[PDB]
Amino acid sequence: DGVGSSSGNWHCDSTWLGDRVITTSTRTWALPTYNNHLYKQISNGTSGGATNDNTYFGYSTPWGYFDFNRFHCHFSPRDWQRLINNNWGFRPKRLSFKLFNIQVKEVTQNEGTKTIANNLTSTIQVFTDSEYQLPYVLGSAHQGCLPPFPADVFMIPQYGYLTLNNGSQAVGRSSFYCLEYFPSQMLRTGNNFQFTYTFEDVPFHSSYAHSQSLDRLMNPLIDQYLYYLSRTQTTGGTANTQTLGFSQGGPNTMANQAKNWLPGPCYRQQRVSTTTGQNNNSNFAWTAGTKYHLNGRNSLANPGIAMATHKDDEERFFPSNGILIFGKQNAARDNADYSDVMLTSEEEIKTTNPVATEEYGIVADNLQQQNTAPQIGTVNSQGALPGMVWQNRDVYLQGPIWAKIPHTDGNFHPSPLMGGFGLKHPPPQILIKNTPVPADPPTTFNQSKLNSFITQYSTGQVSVEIEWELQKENSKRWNPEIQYTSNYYKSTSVDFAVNTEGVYSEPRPIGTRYLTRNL
Amino acid sequence: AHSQSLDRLMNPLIDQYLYYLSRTQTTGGTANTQTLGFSQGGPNTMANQAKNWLPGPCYRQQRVSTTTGQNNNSNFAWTAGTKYHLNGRNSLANPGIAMATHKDDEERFFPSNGILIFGKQNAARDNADYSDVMLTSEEEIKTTNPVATEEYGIVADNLQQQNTAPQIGTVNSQGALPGMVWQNRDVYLQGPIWAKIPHTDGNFHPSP
Amino acid sequence: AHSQSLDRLMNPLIDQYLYYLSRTQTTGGTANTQTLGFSQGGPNTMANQAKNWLPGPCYRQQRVSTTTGQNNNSNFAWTAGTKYHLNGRNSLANPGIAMATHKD
Amino acid sequence: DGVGSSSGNWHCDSTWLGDRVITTSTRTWALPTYNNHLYKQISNGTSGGATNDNTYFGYSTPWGYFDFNRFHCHFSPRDWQRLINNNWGFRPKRLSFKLFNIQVKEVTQNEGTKTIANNLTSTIQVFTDSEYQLPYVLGSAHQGCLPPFPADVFMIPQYGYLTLNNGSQAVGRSSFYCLEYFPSQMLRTGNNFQFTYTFEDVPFHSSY
Amino acid sequence: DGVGSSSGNWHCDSTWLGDRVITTSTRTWALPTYNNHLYKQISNGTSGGATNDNTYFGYSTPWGYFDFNRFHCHFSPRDWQRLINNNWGFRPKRLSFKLFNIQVKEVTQNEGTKTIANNLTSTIQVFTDSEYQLPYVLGSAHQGCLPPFPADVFMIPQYGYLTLNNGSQAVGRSSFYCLEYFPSQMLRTGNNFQFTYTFEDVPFHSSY
């Protein structure tokens, strides 16, 4: 554990062992001093432009955090291809995390000339929130996760949290946390940190698409023995009067046939087209957005429960806030063009799940009578009904992996809505900070806290290893499956590769569901 | 079959210690103004009593009578049928979730596509007469499950105010709510025994 | 009691990497036409941010005030009561599923 | 015990064990050179404004001292809440003190441009007055105790003492102490110091 | 494995054992940062002067490589004379490779005055493509092999590779490689690297 001796090696690999795959990656990082060494109160209120829906109360902290909750932190594009093309399912089993080769540097600025030097005796502090005592800020799809491309050097994100608020104000229940009230390791150059974690049992992700649909599980050639009411009135001529007629479900009457199951739940969303001409001329993104109402505050249900993006033959349509959208490289933060972003599609689940932009179904609204014609209602939100079966949202190479399930008395089907695996005891937050080094103090005692510090940053490498369990395919299907493939024909550059300018980009979103399964 | 019903699980002889809002306005004369009055649930107030549980889920269906004269004169079997919508295709929810076929004293009524019907021997395939088929009844479950042809219940539609009278909504489809208890559909000698549960990520109560 | 709320589980300081549809129409002048605009959720846009969870179930009930003057002048305790219907009989859902009594 | 290796870790916690509670805290500190490396005689007398009630004779020293004699050095506000709300009494039993991760720095000033660098070979000296042979200046409610808030960085207080005086003058009985006449540990970066202490029996405080 | 301790010694010798000869050489090297830390796409096409015969698509990388594939890397002229004058044939049997005495330096430029200093805590990374998973760029007679003369100090060559192209364009089959997706050793000053290799059977060269 010396100044001149390395404390880690570079591990970035994948190994496939038939029923498992193990992924390792190492990246280089830089950490600044954040917040000037201070915790600060932050709020947003209703004054000025601001609106109720957007209020908060919280704190920002001197700490930074390590995030690897994006699939491409771990899987190279080819590796992801191996996985999706060949397996029915996968899930995480365990992980190894390492921090090594720490360098702490002090930067000196005089006279417009800046110089950087090592500070050999400085420390950084690290800890894991093993007991989940801090607010869990992973699982909100933030930036600052390790880069997809290994050669890229990245900056650690700042840590901050939120509590209860009224407008811009705190309430009694509001909580303040100091991270310095936790035990942490202090490392100088030459020291290292590691920890090991085991994933809890969780269901395999479905890397498959159904090749059957709920409404067509019968034998095409045979009638049912079960009747349905087929006629309510006679068909003679002008003489028509009420009658009761009953018929047996059959091949040409598949819609009428008795069935055992129901499609999944529905929370209907407005539909927008990629051909702008077909859209209404208003700015309806929020006004027509699909939302939930919590304590006087309205939130987009984005993306909400999983519903098929579009029905047959309507690729142009998407739910206004019902899909995941990734930026293309260098797409702008605000108001990026359609050509600048990539929209995901959940078309694969039309098979068991309702289309996002359409009704669940129809129910009766009234009681018909001789003098009252029957009336119906369109159902646009449907909660869980017995017999319902459904599929979860897909995961993407540039998508999230896990989320912490909130600690509540109850939940229903706690699969994270953005996609991924939901864990009660997810991987713990890892928090890192540079210890403050004071500049020279006054020569006579002053009680006030020191506000003059040396300027420092640190750099190092980090490693993550994850073991994934695979579910092999067992299909008896005769014909070939759909597969993810690279383009055959010539092109200006290779997809999933660098630029002339050295910039890595991921051209498209890649999902998981290529192989198929019966229902 | 249950010999008790969800709405009558109390002791008939004893009051609750729990109050409910019983009066919103005074009853003096012509002078009436708003007030708040609270009362304790009791034997003659069983409907008002506080309770622990809720009836089962609802997907309401049109009602037809075996006495044809009481039916509307249209052919409404599909147009008024209860359906689900999957990928542009509409299917009858036949027979759908289990709900009681009819309430007290109304044996004549059935859900248009909400029961199982068996043919009598040599009944025709198409357009058989009522006398040629046999209709099942799920009357036994009125005890915990909603009647097929009627609403789940009533919810508020608005916020009442001094100038706004309160308004209500009739609930015709109700998904699962905490506290709900229910019974499954019955089986018959000429009925099916089992079904394969579909291989899906999720399901709710997978009784066929 | 929870000291956090479902709608505020994020990091206040960081943007999401996920976009949402933020503009459906242009904002130029009188010339406005349809467009598609997409934005990233952030600190001042917390309502718009993508989220993993949903609030609990709802069976809505009429509201009454302890200040009588603010109530409607009718006796609406049963007529406006929240109920369930079982076999031709109506029962108050009292107290029913758990919902917060009032907001801030 | 190396330049590149840390000698301590950050411990700031509380654990409650039903009949005991253990508190740990760590803070970051800075120490200046005090007095220019010199002991100096100080007095206050009656000349000018000064009054008899306020006279003293004493010395100031190059040393600094560590003070944690304030409850909030050890208890977070919530922890204090746990204690006061639930217990009739409390008292201290034992303590552990550690000093680690020493950095000594040399500051160079030229021409209005100042630069700070490590001095790897420099030492600091520490000792405990185990035998109570020096004037005990703790217990007078001074400033310079560890901060209540863990993130705060603090400056070590200077050590000075008083003896007998007549006006601004010493008397025969007056005593002079040199701290360099005690044995002390010398630590370079990479060295650490610790000691352990046991409290004598004392009555429980009445938190009631 | 320390800052002040050497990790290697200088071996440059030849020993003749009648049926074998063993050659050892040591050279001093310098490695720059290449490509600004970036992989970059490179192509050559048919526009301008360029012709079809000369088109390519490829990448350039931040890495450098070690090349000793020239006989005079290993044989002094007199040694080569001993070999050619007296033997009918020769071939390689095995090799040992070592990297030692690493120094990483940081260069600071201000105001037209440049200064160079050690960075004690910096690393370099090394690896061998044992499984032949990268494009093999040795064997194309490039420059950058160790110098014939031992006293000469040399600069390490940059690593780049080629794939399939159409004109200046990639094709589907075109492959991109990142060297950071391999495991590599990280060494600070004071660390060293070595590996051993055995040649496969191959025919003797005909020195006749």
Ligand SMILES: Nc1ncnc2c1ncn2[C@@H]1O[C@H](COP(=O)(O)O)[C@@H](O)[C@H]1O
């Ligand atoms: N991503 C997830 N993480 C944790 N629990 C889940 C997740 N998705 C579903 N579940 C739960 O696991 C159950 C598995 O049910 P089954 O497939 O019938 O064995 C579901 O019904 C949910 O309660």
